[PDB]
Amino acid sequence: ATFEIVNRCSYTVWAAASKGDAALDAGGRQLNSGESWTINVEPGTNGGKIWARTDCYFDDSGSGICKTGDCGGLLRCKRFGRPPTTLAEFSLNQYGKDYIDISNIKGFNVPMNFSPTTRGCRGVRCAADIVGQCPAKLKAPGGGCNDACTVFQTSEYCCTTGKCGPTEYSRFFKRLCPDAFSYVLDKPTTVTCPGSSNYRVTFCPTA
């Protein structure tokens, strides 16, 4: 499957793509404002994620650091990124269908639209100014808006036991972005697409 990743932000981002235990395609790449990078994701990929990283510095070997979404200091991500990270999430060719969503469970750093470029389903978007409106206690000093689990490490925010409910913090993310997961047990906003659909992830779709 192809995923065209487009940076419409006025700032550079370093896109990342991983399924947690491996990179998807090259795993990461710099996208200056306006640039597009198309990756190929193997059919059947389960639990894949794409996200933006901000304020990165990498040496000639591809090692360094980003202020949001850093994946073990690598330009080419092999693992998931450090919160806060707005997440485009997908599982492909799962009993014949693809499943996509956007999640704020690991916080928010950059607004995004995640849409199919082929027919059969709609896209999802979280493009509100979550960082600007972020509750004081969730503001990440390194940049972005942290989720409450990251900040407080409680069973209720992290849904450790699996019986958690919505919280004042999850409701903030949900109010700003109704179409993205705000906590682990949020009413699903996952979209079912035809198996083997193709997609486009756009950072700063509206601004």
CATH of the domain at 8: 2.60.110.10
Number of domains in the chain: 1
Query: CA-CA distance, 125 to 111, in Å (whole number)?
Result: 8
**How many other C-beta atoms lie within 10 A of the C-beta of residue 176?**
21
- Using alpha carbons, select from 20, 143, 7, 16 the residue that is nearest to residue 75: 16
Tell me how many degrees the CA angle 21-24-26 measures, rounded to the nearest 5.
115
Specify whether the CB–CB gap between 130 and 150 falls below 8 A.
no
Q: Supply φ then ψ for residue 22, to 5 degrees.
A: -170, 155
Residue 174 parent element (H or E): helix 168-176
Fill in the DSSP letter of residue 154: -
- Using alpha carbons, select from 77, 87, 99, 91 the residue that is nearest to residue 190: 99
Report the SS3 class of residue 4: strand
Cis status of the peptide bond prior to 84, with omega within 30 of 0: yes
Kindly state the tokens that stand for 108: 């928010």
How big, in percent rounded to 5, are the helix, strand and coil portions of the chain? 10, 40, 50
Report the greatest alpha carbon distance in the chain.
46
Q: Which domain holds residue 176?
A: 1-207
Report the SS3 class of residue 169: helix
The distance from CA 20 to its chain's CA centroid, rounded to whole angstroms, is: 13
**In terms of C-beta density within 10 A (0-12 exposed, 13-18 middle, 19 or more buried), how is residue 162 classed?**
exposed
Q: What is the rounded radius of gyration, in angstroms, for the C-alpha atoms of the chain?
A: 16
What are the counts of helices (DSSP H) followed by strands (DSSP E) for the chain? 4, 12
Kindly state the tokens that stand for 45: 């990929």
Report the SS3 class of residue 87: strand
Query: CA-CA distance, 117 to 115, in Å (whole number)?
Result: 6
Report the SS3 class of residue 133: helix
Experimental technique used to determine this entry: X-ray
Specify whether the CB–CB gap between 105 and 181 falls below 8 A.
yes
- Using alpha carbons, select from 141, 24, 195, 155 the residue that is nearest to residue 15: 24
Specify whether the CB–CB gap between 91 and 48 falls below 8 A.
yes
What residues have CB less than 8 Å from 160, skipping those under 6 apart? none
Going 27 to 123 to 35 to 109, the CA torsion angle's sign is negative
Torsion angle, CA of 166/82/49/76, rounded to 10 degrees? Answer: 180
Resolution (A): 1.2
**How many other C-beta atoms lie within 10 A of the C-beta of residue 120?**
13
What residues have CB less than 8 Å from 163, skipping those under 6 apart? none
